[PDB]
Design a protein around this ligand. Structure first.
Ligand SMILES: CCCc1cc2[nH]c(=O)ccc2c(C)n1
Length: 183
């Protein structure tokens, strides 16, 4: 069971990941968690973030270049993710492929139906073979942040990459857990 937690609010997602983990473990399930990008473990992620902040020449002049680097990080985790799914009942990912679609589309001033999102879907899911999540959970509601939120919500509405669930900060974790993996 592979669950991706998505959204624009990082502190909010983290708290959600942890409380969801606790709900599943209260039910007696084994849970592993993994956050993307894997800053500090993946040199591709690190380069991408550094570039975004002005390093590595003109790299951040291209939104695709940076999406590609985040995609390669995830590609380097395909094996780790499969191992986690064998070893554990529930694998929760704090941000995953939809994130790359939403942020990239937002930086390009595109929406969910545009070139960048479609490209992320082919590159990460078809070409690199990243496992499709069983659930993508959007934790809903800074011009960028807002644009990204909007792309996220369109992606959720279209069932991009699989089945979605949209929730607020008020969500009860045990209630969400029960919706996600009903006993
Ligand atoms: C930097 C260019 C657009 C972009 C792509 C991203 N992809 C991811 O997988 C995770 C985060 C992320 C962010 C913040 N921004």
């Amino acid at each position: 069971m592979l669950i991706a937690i998505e959204g624009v609010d990082g502190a909010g997602k983290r708290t959600l990941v942890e409380k969801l983990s606790g709900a599943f473990r209260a039910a007696g399930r084994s849970v592993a968690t993994l956050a993307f990008p894997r800053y500090g473990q993946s040199v591709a992620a690190d380069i991408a973030a550094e570039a975004l902040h002005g390093e590595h020449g003109d790299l951040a002049s291209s939104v695709y270049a940076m999406a590609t680097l985040f995609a390669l990080d995830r590609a380097g985790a395909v094996h780790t993710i499969q191992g986690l799914c064998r070893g554990y009942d529930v694998v929760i990912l704090d941000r995953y492929v939809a994130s790359n679609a939403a942020y990239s589309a937002a930086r390009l001033h595109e929406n969910a139906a545009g070139k960048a999102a479609a490209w992320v879907q082919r590159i990460e899911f078809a070409r690199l073979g990243l496992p499709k999540p069983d659930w993508q959970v959007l934790l809903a509601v800074a011009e960028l942040q807002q644009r990204t939120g909007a792309v996220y919500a369109e992606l959720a509405a279209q069932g991009w990459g699989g089945r979605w669930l949209v929730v607020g900060a008020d969500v009860d974790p045990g209630r969400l857990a029960a919706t996600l993996a009903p006993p």
